[PDB]
Write a protein that binds this ligand. Sequence first.
Ligand SMILES: [K+]
Ligand SMILES: [K+]
Ligand SMILES: [K+]
Ligand SMILES: [K+]
Ligand SMILES: [Mg+2]
Ligand SMILES: [Mg+2]
Ligand SMILES: [Mg+2]
Ligand SMILES: [Mg+2]
Ligand SMILES: [Mg+2]
Ligand SMILES: [Mg+2]
Ligand SMILES: [Mg+2]
Ligand SMILES: [Mg+2]
Ligand SMILES: [Mg+2]
Ligand SMILES: [Mg+2]
Ligand SMILES: [Mg+2]
Ligand SMILES: [Mg+2]
Ligand SMILES: [Zn+2]
Ligand SMILES: [Zn+2]
Lengths: 51, 238, 100, 82, 94, 56
Amino acid sequence: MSHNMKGQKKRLAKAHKQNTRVPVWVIVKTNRKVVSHPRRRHWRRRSLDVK
Amino acid sequence: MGKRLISQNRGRGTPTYRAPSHKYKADLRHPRVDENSSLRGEVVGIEHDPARSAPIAKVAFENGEELFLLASEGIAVGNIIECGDDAEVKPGNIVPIGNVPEGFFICNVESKPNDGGKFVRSSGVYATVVTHEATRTAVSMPSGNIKWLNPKCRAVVGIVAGSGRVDRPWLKAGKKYHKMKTRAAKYPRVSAVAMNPRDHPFGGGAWKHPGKPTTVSRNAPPGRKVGLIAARRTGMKR
Amino acid sequence: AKPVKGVSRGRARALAAKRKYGHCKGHGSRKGKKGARTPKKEQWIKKIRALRRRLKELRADGALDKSVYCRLYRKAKGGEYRSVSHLNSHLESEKLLKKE
Amino acid sequence: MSSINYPFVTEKAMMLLDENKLQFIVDTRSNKKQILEDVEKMYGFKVKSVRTMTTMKGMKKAVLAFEEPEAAHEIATRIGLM
Amino acid sequence: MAKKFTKKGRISRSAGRFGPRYGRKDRKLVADLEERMRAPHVCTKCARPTVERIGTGIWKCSKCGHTFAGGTYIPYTSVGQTLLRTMKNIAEAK
Amino acid sequence: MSKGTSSMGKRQKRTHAKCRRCGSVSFNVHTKQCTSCGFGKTSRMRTYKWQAKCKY
RNA sequence: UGGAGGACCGUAAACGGUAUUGAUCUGCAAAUCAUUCGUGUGACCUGCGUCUCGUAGUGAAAUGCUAAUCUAACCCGGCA
RNA sequence: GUGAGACUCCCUGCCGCCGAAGGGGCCAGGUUUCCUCGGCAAUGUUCGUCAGCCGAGGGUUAGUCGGUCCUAAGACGUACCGUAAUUCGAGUACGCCGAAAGGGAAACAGGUUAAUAUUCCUGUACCAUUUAGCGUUUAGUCUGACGUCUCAGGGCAAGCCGAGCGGCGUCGUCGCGCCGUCUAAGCAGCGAACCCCGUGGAGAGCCGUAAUGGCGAGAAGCGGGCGAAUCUGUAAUGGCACAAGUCGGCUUCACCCCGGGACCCGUGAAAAGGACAGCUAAAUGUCCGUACCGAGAACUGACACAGGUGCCCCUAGCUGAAAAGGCUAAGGCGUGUCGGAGUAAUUCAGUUAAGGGAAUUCGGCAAAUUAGCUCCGUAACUUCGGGAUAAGGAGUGCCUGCUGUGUAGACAGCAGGUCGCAGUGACCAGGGGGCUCUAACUGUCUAAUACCAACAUAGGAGAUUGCAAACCCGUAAGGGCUAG
Ligand SMILES: [K+]
Ligand SMILES: [K+]
Ligand SMILES: [K+]
Ligand SMILES: [K+]
Ligand SMILES: [Mg+2]
Ligand SMILES: [Mg+2]
Ligand SMILES: [Mg+2]
Ligand SMILES: [Mg+2]
Ligand SMILES: [Mg+2]
Ligand SMILES: [Mg+2]
Ligand SMILES: [Mg+2]
Ligand SMILES: [Mg+2]
Ligand SMILES: [Mg+2]
Ligand SMILES: [Mg+2]
Ligand SMILES: [Mg+2]
Ligand SMILES: [Mg+2]
Ligand SMILES: [Zn+2]
Ligand SMILES: [Zn+2]
């Protein structure tokens, strides 16, 4: 239970909501040309450089 | 650049060689007294001085200022310390050394008048008043040298308290270690012959020896003035 | 919730009763040093407190005047008496009690 | 500048209506005083207290207790939740 | 009144806390210093042997509370007493 | 204790925080300076000619 | 009686790292494991904070250590 | 059972693991891993319907818990001055920051969710400021505020015993074993030690302590004041199978209160804040954190890594000196995440081994021996401290009945009977001695081939310097040593 300030937790929240798959409708719209993005990660890996 | 010596490290001011100043009680000096003035104070406590390993006296003066004084032997709680050119020449009083009779023991002696006290401040040491002259007064230092001082230089009458502190042998590295924790001095110390040549002029060699004479010239530059510095002579007296 | 399966202590109770009686406690059962089983300062504390309370009550109830009480108190402090019984025996042999 | 974004309508947030409390998503830059004044001006009901928390979506949620009974139901009906 | 001073025990004195360490010479020095410092010291204010060391160079009388600065291990040194006797002789002569 | 993997378990802290000015995690928490942009040392942006090659 | 000591024994508390020249040696591990060992009220061990650094620092001194790098670290530049 | 599919996912039972850590709490760190549902291409050292994986949705509520406030070592800013100059530099002055383990205003029990709960709800409290009224300084003191070692007294969480009551287990015989028999803050009351005040007058000496001690410079004795932890009541209706819910006793660490002593060439922080004059009412108490892991799978070491961070702080019964080791609770697990089969050599790690007993080998390397406690007894040499557990001998279980010390817990001892090859029966647990070299000793060291005779050390000696010093840093301004 490390203790974050408001901004550190906001940056963690942004990192968390960035770690989502591309929407299926985006894949349909681009005709399978956009299927991923570079901000995918896993929590148990090389950590965030955010906080 | 074969590395700098311990003395150069200390001159640099790194934490390893700095005094733990926050541990100390007071910057011991005489109370400030204007020309042709006096002040009286009473001793309220005798305290341990960590910076000297000798007692200090806490004095409440008439002017409302409380000051730590270098304690002379026999100074007691409730004593009235007088400081001035007209003060009675008694143990614990701060008087000019021109008013001290020959053969009296003084301590905490000013280098110049109103300097605060420079000489004769370690536990048990004292100075003796030898001669009086019109412009100079001479005292015998704890080192044995004769010092010609201004007769207006102030000094507390008596000897410094804590006599015999080093009569007890350390007996043990740990006891001296505990003393050295309150000082700036590095403890313990490696002999120079045990070092490598990059670390000291005496370092290196297949066997331990300086390789050069240990008496060094007074002209030798920093990083070289090691061993017996400008020694008049060496050895035990024949 | 299934019942907690404790640790039954009945056979420890039988052993503790025997040990209270002074059995199952011989030299082949002792493992700690004499001093870890009976610390010496506690022994002295109980001994001297018993002796001092006995002397205080004897001085209070008129069986012992202050002059001999002082000497007996110092003797007890000096380990001259093993217990209260030894002190009473010395009192009765020396006739130091102001009998009436 | 209104601190109130919209009522939070989840299962736990809807469980507040049965205790006369109402949960809002609010501006994270605003505080409890601003939230109270904004809600009291927005719906005209006296607010007993404000509880606020920040989430891992970067939002700020405020739970408002009201003084007048049924005020949470009246606001939830005015908005269209109920 | 004192310890069981055995047939061999009167050498180490208080330096028996060191065991066989530090050599005989320094053990003797420390033992002699302890014997001198633990001795009764008469109070110059009430004249009874109740002066004990309260700290390094600080001495207090257990009876009258008289606290003063003295030697590190001795309440009164010979140099300080020499100063006192010089001043006393001067005061008497006049 | 080995200088390798064992001593690398004590890595539960930081020497550099996120920089207000530039966003780089280069703000030395002891010297109070950003080693990337110079924030906390200068009002200007940290730049050196040796950050590229001699343009010839 | 008392309770001192860089006192003793001793913990798979903690710290260290003797010997097996054992296991392992594309390892569990870019130095670990087992057994066996040293210290364990003190020059003790340790958390967090803080300071001292490149011809400089730090070193109870081995050229040891200064981010798996040390008889002058690392990055970029001089440099193709 | 589920499922298309089951060693591997779920339930019950049996059999196991850890049980002073593999359980509990939480820092840093992680950053959603938490919860629910739906999945199984990859990840998981096998499989998988499972999952810290994949997808979707949800989850963190504070005047009282922290941060926030204070200052510490020590940074940073401005100014001054230096510098060719600066974002560079020491010092000074003024500021300002610097501790989620120092200081510190105040809240508890119960319930509620799938996931939050001293935060939400119920009940019962408390603190701070502002305002209004009612009254006002004692002012500058005290407190905050302190080391190491050792010990007494008092209390208490945990623990244990007996009785009643209520359940469960066992029930071949017996009547035992286990679980429960509860209860917060707040409020009110009492007050041990210390200290102080009034009497008293104590020596061919008296009074005390565990110990040191105290006393005509006023002991004992007698009155008073001040003053703890805790305990008692109230809160007492809350939770409990609306099952009982009532009592006693013992002990008490590793926690709280209180007091004493010893040691120091070592002297053991500061500041905010608080107390000393406040009572009544109303209003206000913003901001940030809060999920979950905290590690043999949530951190770090590229990993679901036998390392490290953290064994950091806690821990029930028996044995036992014990937190050792063993066997068991509670709690956590059968995931230190491949299985089957049972048949060669060889190999890692163990058990045993006739007769011999170091003949092995560079070398007793490795292994074996001894081992707890009590009693007897203990050499050369020695710095008189030690050597020392030297060496070398004897005892030890169980049962029956007792004795002594002690307020007690307990501890020590005796007599008789008795079984085995063996009684510290397992566990745990020195092998010993003699003569040399070397370093006095405890200590330090080549992180990752050298733990040594090397380094250090106390001791001994020499040298410089009287302080605007010696020595040393800086280009300077100015510094270290030096609050000397
Ligand atoms: K050096
Ligand atoms: K040396
Ligand atoms: K929690
Ligand atoms: K010598
Ligand atoms: Mg050279
Ligand atoms: Mg390295
Ligand atoms: Mg160019
Ligand atoms: Mg040991
Ligand atoms: Mg290059
Ligand atoms: Mg077990
Ligand atoms: Mg698979
Ligand atoms: Mg909050
Ligand atoms: Mg601050
Ligand atoms: Mg197999
Ligand atoms: Mg040695
Ligand atoms: Mg040597
Ligand atoms: Zn006196
Ligand atoms: Zn930056």
